[PDB]
Amino acid sequence: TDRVSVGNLRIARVLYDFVNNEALPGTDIDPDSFWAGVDKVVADLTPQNQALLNARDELQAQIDKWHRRRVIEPIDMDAYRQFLTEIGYLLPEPDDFTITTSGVDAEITTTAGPQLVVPVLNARFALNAANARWGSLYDALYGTDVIPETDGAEKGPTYNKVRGDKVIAYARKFLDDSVPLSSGSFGDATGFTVQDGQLVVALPDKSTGLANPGQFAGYTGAAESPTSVLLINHGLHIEILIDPESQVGTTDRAGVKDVILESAITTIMDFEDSVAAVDAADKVLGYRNWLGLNKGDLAALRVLNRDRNYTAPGGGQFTLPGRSLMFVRNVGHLMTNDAIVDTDGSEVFEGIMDALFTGLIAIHGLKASDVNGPLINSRTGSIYIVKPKMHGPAEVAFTCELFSRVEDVLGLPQNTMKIGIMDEERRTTVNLKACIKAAADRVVFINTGFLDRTGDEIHTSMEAGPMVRKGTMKSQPWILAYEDHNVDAGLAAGFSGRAQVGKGMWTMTELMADMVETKIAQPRAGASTAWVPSPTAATLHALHYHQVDVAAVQQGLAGKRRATIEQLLTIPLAKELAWAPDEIREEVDNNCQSILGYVVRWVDQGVGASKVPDIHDVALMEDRATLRISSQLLANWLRHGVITSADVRASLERMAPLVDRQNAGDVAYRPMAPNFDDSIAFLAAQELILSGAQQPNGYTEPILHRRRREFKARAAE
Numbered sequence: 001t002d003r004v005s006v007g008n009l010r011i012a013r014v015l016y017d018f019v020n021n022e023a024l025p026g027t028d029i030d031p032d033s034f035w036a037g038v039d040k041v042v043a044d045l046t047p048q049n050q051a052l053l054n055a056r057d058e059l060q061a062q063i064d065k066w067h068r069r070r071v072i073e074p075i076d077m078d079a080y081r082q083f084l085t086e087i088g089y090l091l092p093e094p095d096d097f098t099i100t101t102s103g104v105d106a107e108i109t110t111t112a113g114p115q116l117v118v119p120v121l122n123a124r125f126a127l128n129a130a131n132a133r134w135g136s137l138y139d140a141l142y143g144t145d146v147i148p149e150t151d152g153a154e155k156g157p158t159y160n161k162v163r164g165d166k167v168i169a170y171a172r173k174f175l176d177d178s179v180p181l182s183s184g185s186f187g188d189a190t191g192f193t194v195q196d197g198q199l200v201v202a203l204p205d206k207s208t209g210l211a212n213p214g215q216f217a218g219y220t221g222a223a224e225s226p227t228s229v230l231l232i233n234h235g236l237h238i239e240i241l242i243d244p245e246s247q248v249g250t251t252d253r254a255g256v257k258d259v260i261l262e263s264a265i266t267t268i269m270d271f272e273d274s275v276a277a278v279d280a281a282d283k284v285l286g287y288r289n290w291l292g293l294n295k296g297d298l299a300a301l302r303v304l305n306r307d308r309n310y311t312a313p314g315g316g317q318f319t320l321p322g323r324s325l326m327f328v329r330n331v332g333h334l335m336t337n338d339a340i341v342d343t344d345g346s347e348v349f350e351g352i353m354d355a356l357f358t359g360l361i362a363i364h365g366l367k368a369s370d371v372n373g374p375l376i377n378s379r380t381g382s383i384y385i386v387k388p389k390m391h392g393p394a395e396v397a398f399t400c401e402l403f404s405r406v407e408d409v410l411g412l413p414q415n416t417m418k419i420g421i422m423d424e425e426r427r428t429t430v431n432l433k434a435c436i437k438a439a440a441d442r443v444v445f446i447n448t449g450f451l452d453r454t455g456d457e458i459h460t461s462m463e464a465g466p467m468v469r470k471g472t473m474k475s476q477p478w479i480l481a482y483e484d485h486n487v488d489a490g491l492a493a494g495f496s497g498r499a500q501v502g503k504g505m506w507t508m509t510e511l512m513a514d515m516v517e518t519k520i521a522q523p524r525a526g527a528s529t530a531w532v533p534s535p536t537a538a539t540l541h542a543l544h545y546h547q548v549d550v551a552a553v554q555q556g557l558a559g560k561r562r563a564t565i566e567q568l569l570t571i572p573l574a575k576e577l578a579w580a581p582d583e584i585r586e587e588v589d590n591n592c593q594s595i596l597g598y599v600v601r602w603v604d605q606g607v608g609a610s611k612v613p614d615i616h617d618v619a620l621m622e623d624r625a626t627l628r629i630s631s632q633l634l635a636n637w638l639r640h641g642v643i644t645s646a647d648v649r650a651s652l653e654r655m656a657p658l659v660d661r662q663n664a665g666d667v668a669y670r671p672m673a674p675n676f677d678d679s680i681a682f683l684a685a686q687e688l689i690l691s692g693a694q695q696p697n698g699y700t701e702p703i704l705h706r707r708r709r710e711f712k713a714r715a716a717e
């Protein structure tokens with residue numbers, strides 16, 4: 001392209017140069033030995049990678065055939081389960097065990113709080129996410145519909161005092177609920193002082209302390225007239241900023257300017273479903289941002305925050321981290337990428353490359369940043385890698401062996417590279433204990449989702465019959481059981497106090513009132529973390545962890561088995577004649593708009609995540625798993641005669657101009673309508689649906705990557 005020869009590999013020059021000039025210096029790793037390591041690891045692990053992919057296909061073919069030779073309407077669970085066991089899909093449950101993972105930071109082992117996920121190719125967003133460890137509660141309340149924009153309290157071009165007062169009152173109630181006063185309410189506070197290491201809150205008629213003095217964590221400024229007061233509840237910090245001479249402070253009874261919440265405790269820097277990266281140039285853009293993050297010098301000048309200084313209650317000095325602790329999500333076992341090809345021209349597995357390169361790069365986050373002093377990331381010496389889309393314990397074991405070999409190449413101690421196991425494929429769900437066991441000395445989390453897991457659910461039972469609607473899926477018995485089972489398995493493996501048990505993303509970015517009402521379900525269900533789409537959502541989701549004592553919840557769940565294998569295996573088949581014709585067309589339109597809305601940005605602009613208007617103009621921020629579910633759902637309805645290929649076409653044709661219109665705010669946008677078959681993005685959308693049934697596990701990357709490359713190539717006219 002050109003390329004650099006290293007043993008059997010031919011490495012794109014842009015990648016070779018990036019590694020030598022930017023990634024390797026400072027790690028003390030010999031460049032020649034690194035490259036030899038890449039060649040050797042790729043040579044050794046590629047056949048097993050392929051074998052695992054082939055095993056997926058064989059298992060799916062047998063399941064397809066199982067359904068096709070049967071006609072008995074309600075599936076016979078006893079026979080179905082027996083079959084899955086016979087073919088090696090459902091494996092024996094291993095004996096009880098406790099994970100042994102060590103060298104993990106407090107943010108992961110102990111603290112319960114929000115976890116942000118952000119596309120690594122977007123430097124600005126990545127920087128904001130890393131800085132989202134602390135976030136303004138006032139900004140999050142004033143800025144969103146959590147304070148409804150009723151008559152009088154609407155957002156204007158400038159400060160609305162009626163709304164501001166609602167913000168202040170909301171936050172006073174939060175303080176009363178989270179760090180209660182011995183007597184009275186924060187609502188009536190007139191001032192704060194620190195006396196003999198104790199926080200003293202002035203009320204109109206008297207003073208009072210905290211009902212739990214231990215929740216006083218520190219302050220800034222003079223004890224007798226502090227600039228801020230720091231509190232702690234359920235392990236998360238709350239900072240009341242005091243400034244009577246500020247916009248908001250001047251209107252406040254105690255001169256309070258803002259309430260800052262410790263928010264995004266951890267952040268996942270994403271190389272997978274939220275980015276579009278289809279070649280060496282794209283991968284290098286991502287690797288370079290990941291590098292800047294770990295070295296602490298990424299600047300877009302928007303830069304990375306320093307740690308925060310405080311005075312302890314007794315008068316001593318301390319610091320708290322000002323940055324979100326970073327994971328990186330590598331791609332999974334499926335895709336290859338032409339950033340490296342072999343002597344035959346065969347592309348190298350992208351997951352293997354990500355392990356080597358993001359692993360190398362992460363070394364920088366384990367050492368002092370030349371910018372602001374202290375090392376950026378893990379003080380305990382771990383590298384946290386989220387590994388998506390695995391199917392079963394052999395695939396987890398493979399990932400661990402991959403990490404083991406990379407560690408050897410990088411000169412890292414064994415088990416430095418920790419694994420966040422995504423539970424987003426059915427064959428992992430039903431063998432979860434075994435998957436955790438295979439990574440018992442590396443695992444730092446498990447997590448559940450809606451989108452990918454539902455995509456796998458549909459594809460796996462594609463031949464069984466028509467599935468329920470997309471919106472219906474999120475409340476089906478299989479998924480509710482999957483959610484509980486994930487928690488059960490993690491807690492039984494001793495995750496409490498050792499590893500994160502995590503839940504899925506809130507995708508409706510503008511519907512924050514609904515988020516605050518609803519997402520509380522997740523920490524109530526024993527999750528020590530869950531996914532948020534923005535720093536703003538991280539600050540709001542933090543509220544939930546102040547209301548819910550996750551550590552106590554997990555202790556209470558101990559020993560409980562709340563999901564059976566039968567519940568897990570309950571296929572979401574639609575009942576006979578479940579929909580009217582208008583409902584069918586609505587669901588078709590929903591899915592085509594979902595696919596078109598996402599695919600047009602991906603293919604034409606290389607954007608893998610953004611705020612996308614749905615069919616009802618609700619802003620959704622979904623990653624690529626949205627494509628997997630929608631295309632699989634339509635493929636399934638087309639497969640079983642629910643809709644015809646003309647229904648699909650007409651819907652694509654109806655939805656495309658609507659998508660075009662929804663993208664009017666974009667200088668770079670290129671309309672799909674009316675020259676449909678001249679738009680590579682439109683053809684991509686069509687191809688995802690019509691070829692959906694034949695994509696391995698319904699994965700959208702093979703078609704998406706090809707189409708994006710096609711667009712890129714023709715752009716080079």
Ligand SMILES: O=C(O)[C@H](O)Cc1c[nH]c2ccccc12
Pocket residue numbers: 117118119270273274424448449450451452453504505507533609621622623624625626
């Ligand atoms: O499985 C699911 O529910 C989704 O894949 C998760 C998800 C939704 N929006 C996102 C934005 C960035 C990163 C991940 C996501």
Ligand SMILES: [Mg+2]
Pocket residue numbers: 273388389424449452625
């Ligand atoms: Mg996913």
